[PDB]
Design a protein around this ligand. Structure first.
Ligand SMILES: [Zn+2]
Ligand SMILES: [Zn+2]
Ligand SMILES: [Zn+2]
Ligand SMILES: [Zn+2]
Lengths: 142, 55, 146, 136, 87, 141, 58, 194
């Protein structure tokens, strides 16, 4: 990754490097863990889950905590440490807990609806438990 | 009428590499595995055996 | 766009397609065959130029792993590109002038029974050795060097 | 064959045994095999049903689409036909000299009672009444 | 009028032959026990997405006898002309 | 026509040419033959631009529709076949007759196709539907 | 007796091959010449001695 | 991936036909694993769609393996570039493509012509004969323009291969045309019919 961004990490990369380096360890384990004893839908879920976490950590450091400068935050977007297109959603009102961009692509669904996990729980038959097939998200709206 | 929800074990600490559960927060109630009672097991054990005894 | 690891996982799990777990997908895997010459064409078009040690390419991949299409068209500014290959002519001549023995690589580079390598296990972590690049002079070539 | 069948008596026999209410339970999910195995690892997220299978000795568990379509050896058909045949019926007595029918459930006397004209109009439809006796 | 009517009628063939190699429906069922209280259903019919990478699904190398001909047209001849044994 | 002089001899059928029609609306000559071929000759090049393949035996006759871009052809295979003049697609096969179809003629109104056969019938065809809506049995031979 | 080496005494018939009687019965294998070709239709020019004008032209 | 895909995808076609006595090795050579009966050797005779696809995948593997060797740090950038240069000049000697498409001799010639063009300008002065001429771009381009036109051809051909492999072969009662030897028997048909 860092080879492919040419400039050096700008300012306080040491604050985020040990955490990002742990997400890398997580992601490689998720790639190589056996697909046996798991649903054909389940095995992809940790990938989307870890990719959500890592993007969320970079995002929270810059926006909520302000512990990294914009140049270091934008560096993480440039170095593909965080998905700019997922962070682009968490800025939108009503999307601030979105699990993955695949769940808001309405075009890919049979009827042109969003994913069911995007329905607010108060609008469900709220005893109902959800695990959406795209990522196992139980509900990510309200 | 003219026309409560459960609570979820949220841990939105994004740095908590092991502990974070964003959208994947379970309900605190959530019965993540279901197994029949031993009475129902014994009935259903013979059912699969009768199916398998066709051989 | 979505995580690189998704297609990697999918491809790795579907494996050699002998397992019955993905028996449903075998028929999709065959139907992709008529579009395989397209995937070859788009891949070789996007092959890195020798001054690039890695090129990242946009891919469009079947959700089931069946085919990967390199979705780019690689476009160049032809003075920059004529120039970039101009420097290659200089460097490669200078190497062939100056190398004692130029061992050409052996073809095929892998044996007929050698199974293909996995990018993640063998090639992702080994840092690439340097490309062919002319050392541009920062004073004379300063309009272009950076 | 079926567009033009006219046995109105057979139509009545069918009407009087067809289920009137729509039975919706035949659209519930399949029973969860992992729950039959005792190991449903999805818990309350499982869409499939967590309940007793049909006992495999009951012939209703062993059905074939071809049997049910062509109408041969269908278990549920035989369970219907038997119970429809077991229903009680009128049948005339061996006394071939008898041509009398008792009629009942006429209600009490007064405004609830059927008139003799009521039986006259309903029953002269079928044949020539020799006598009608009313017992209000 | 005949040319245009016939043209578009066989255009539908050839276009669908060289291609061979929201919307709703309001439904008034006759089984009036019905949907709850309703003389009519209304349903959204979406079209299921075809996978472009999926090959032809089913065998069509089957062969079966032709449909029997349309029933005999009466033969409508002039009466037989008698052949002599000389003929 | 006026002087009888042979302008051109066009060669290209494998065997006997036995249907020939000049299109009323196109610079095309259509021809078919005992070799099962049906050929469109572009008279602006004197060359076979299109083939219509599907006949199983000798093409007996063909007729070019007066107002559609449609060609109909008979054969010994007891079918008349209707062709899209442009895409060469077989828009209909008139599988009514029971012996070789000897003649066909086209017109703009219904019946757009009329066919004669060695089964001694004449048939009138609905060219939209592709079904014979009359059979004239009156011929003995 | 030899009888396999017989001619067509019996009549030929057809009209039931691939894609005849139903447009879905075309197999997706199609012949090399079935490609689209000559798709712009030519027509005869105006004033070609057309029938009604020819009739006028006694 | 494209090599894994293509390799898997040709293997499935072998196994779809139950030709389990053939083996497709990883460089895409198709080896019979046993001596073939007349039945087996007839039944397993794949045509030019399978093999031209297989040989295009062979070429692709030569290219990607040249890059993989570089990326394993066991070839340098100069040997990669010379290696790519060699591949695209000698496609007609590292692959069997010409067997399934003799018109490809047009491109084989053209990459031989560009090599003489490039080398005699490259090998000038102290730069002598021998390996190292890695200016691979002219040779590479030739095969991309080959692929431009072969892509729709194989798309159609592999479609026809697949469709009869899935739909079956409908071709009963297709009109057999009349050709050189068949003319004289066809004249006698139509004579006797008339
Ligand atoms: Zn999601
Ligand atoms: Zn979802
Ligand atoms: Zn969600
Ligand atoms: Zn379950």
């Amino acid at each position: 990754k860092l080879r492919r961004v040419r400039k050096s990490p700008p300012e306080g990369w040491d604050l985020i490097e040990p955490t990002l380096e742990q997400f890398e360890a997580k992601m490689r384990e998720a790639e190589t863990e056996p697909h046996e004893g798991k649903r054909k839908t389940e095995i992809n879920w940790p990938i989307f889950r870890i990719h959500h976490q890592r993007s969320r950590y970079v995002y929270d450091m810059y926006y909520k905590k302000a512990e990294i400068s914009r140049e270091l935050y934008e560096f993480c977007l440039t170095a593909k440490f965080a998905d700019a297109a997922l962070i682009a959603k968490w800025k939108k009102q009503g999307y601030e807990n979105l699990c993955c961009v695949k769940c808001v692509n309405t075009r890919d669904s049979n009827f042109g609806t969003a994913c069911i996990c995007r329905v607010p729980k108060s609008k469900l038959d709220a005893e109902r438990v959800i695990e959406c097939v795209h990522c196992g998200c139980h509900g990510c709206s309200g | 009428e003219k026309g409560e929800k459960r609570k979820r074990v949220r841990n939105d600490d994004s740095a908590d590499i092991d502990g974070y559960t964003g959208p994947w927060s379970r309900f605190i109630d959530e019965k993540t595995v279901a197994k029949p009672t031993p009475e129902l097991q014994k009935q259903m054990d013979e059912i699969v055996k009768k199916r398998q005894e066709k051989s | 766009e979505m995580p690189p690891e998704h297609v990697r996982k999918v491809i790795r799990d579907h494996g050699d397609m002998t397992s019955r777990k993905y028996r449903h997908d075998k028929r999709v895997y065959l139907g992709a065959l008529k579009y395989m010459p397209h995937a070859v064409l788009k891949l070789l078009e996007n092959m890195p130029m020798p001054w690039e040690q890695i090129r990242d390419v946009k891919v469009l991949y079947h959700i089931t792993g069946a085919i990967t299409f390199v979705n780019d068209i690689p476009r160049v500014i032809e003075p920059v590109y004529m120039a970039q290959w101009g420097t290659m002519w200089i460097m490669m001549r200078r190497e062939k002038r100056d190398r004692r023995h130029f061992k050409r690589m052996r073809f095929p580079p892998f044996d007929d029974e050698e199974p293909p390598l996995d990018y993640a296990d063998n090639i992702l972590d080994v840092e690439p050795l340097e490309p062919i690049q002319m050392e541009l002079d920062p004073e004379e070539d300063g309009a272009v060097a950076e | 064959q079926i567009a033009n069948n006219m046995d109105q008596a057979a139509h009545d026999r069918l009407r009087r045994m067809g289920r009137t209410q729509p039975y919706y339970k035949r659209n519930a999910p399949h029973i969860c095999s992992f729950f039959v195995k005792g190991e449903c690892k999805r818990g309350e997220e499982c869409p499939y049903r967590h309940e007793k299978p049909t006992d495999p000795d009951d012939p209703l568990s062993r059905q074939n689409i071809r049997d049910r379509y062509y109408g041969t050896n269908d278990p549920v058909a035989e369970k219907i036909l038997n119970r429809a045949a077991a229903a009680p019926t009128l049948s005339p007595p061996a006394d071939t000299t008898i041509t009398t029918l008792y009629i009942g459930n006429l209600g009490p006397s007064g405004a609830q009672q059927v008139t003799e004209k009521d039986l006259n109009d309903f029953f002269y439809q079928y044949g020539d009444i020799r006598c009608l006796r009313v017992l209000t | 009028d005949a040319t245009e009517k016939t043209r578009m009628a066989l255009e539908k063939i050839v276009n669908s032959k060289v291609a061979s190699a929201a919307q709703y429906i309001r439904y008034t069922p006759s089984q009036q026990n019905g949907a709850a209280g309703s003389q009519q259903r209304i349903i959204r019919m979406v079209e299921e997405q075809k996978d472009p990478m999926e090959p032809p699904k089913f065998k069509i190398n089957q062969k079966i006898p032709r449909a029997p001909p349309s029933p005999p047209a009466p033969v409508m001849h002039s009466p037989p002309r008698k052949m002599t044994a000389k003929d | 026509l006026a002087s009888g002089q042979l302008k051109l001899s066009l060669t290209g059928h494998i065997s006997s040419v036995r249907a020939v029609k000049v299109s009323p609306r196109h610079p095309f000559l259509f021809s078919g033959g005992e070799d099962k071929q049906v050929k469109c000759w572009d008279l602006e090049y004197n060359k076979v631009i299109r083939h219509y393949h599907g006949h199983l035996s000798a093409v007996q006759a063909l007729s070019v529709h007066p107002s559609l871009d449609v060609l109909v052809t008979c054969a010994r295979d007891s079918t008349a076949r209707v062709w899209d003049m442009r895409t060469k697609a077989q828009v209909h096969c008139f599988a009514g007759h029971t012996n070789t179809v000897a003649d066909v003629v086209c017109q703009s109104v219904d019946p757009q196709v009329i066919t004669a056969s060695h089964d001694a019938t004449v048939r009138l065809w609905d060219l939209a539907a592709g079904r014979s809506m009359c059979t004239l049995t009156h011929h003995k031979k | 007796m030899t009888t396999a080496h017989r001619p067509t005494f019996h009549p030929a018939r057809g009209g039931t091959a691939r894609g005849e009687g139903d447009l879905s019965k075309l197999s997706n294998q199609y012949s090399s010449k079935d490609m689209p070709s000559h798709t712009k239709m030519k027509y005869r020019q105006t004033g070609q001695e057309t029938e009604a004008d020819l009739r006028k032209k006694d | 991936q494209v090599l894994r895909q293509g390799y898997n995808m040709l293997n499935l076609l072998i196994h779809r036909k139950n030709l389990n006595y053939l083996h497709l090795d990883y460089n895409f050579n198709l080896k019979p694993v046993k001596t073939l009966t007349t039945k087996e050797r007839k039944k397993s005779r794949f045509g030019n769609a399978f093999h031209l696809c297989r040989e295009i995948l062979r070429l692709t593997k030569l290219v990607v393996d040249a890059h993989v060797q570089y990326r394993l740090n066991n070839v340098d950038a100069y040997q990669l570039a010379d290696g790519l240069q060699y591949i695209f000049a000698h496609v007609g000697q590292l692959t069997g493509m010409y067997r399934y498409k003799y018109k490809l001799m047009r491109q084989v010639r053209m990459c031989k012509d560009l090599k003489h063009l490039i080398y005699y300008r490259f090998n000038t002065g102290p730069v002598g004969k021998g390996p190292g001429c890695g200016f691979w771009a002219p040779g590479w381009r030739v095969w991309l323009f080959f692929l431009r036109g072969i892509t729709p051809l194989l798309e159609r051909w592999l479609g026809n291969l697949l469709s009869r492999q899935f739909e079956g072969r409908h071709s009963k009662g297709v009109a057999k045309t009349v050709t050189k030897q068949r003319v004289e028997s066809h004249f006698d048909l139509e004579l006797r019919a008339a």
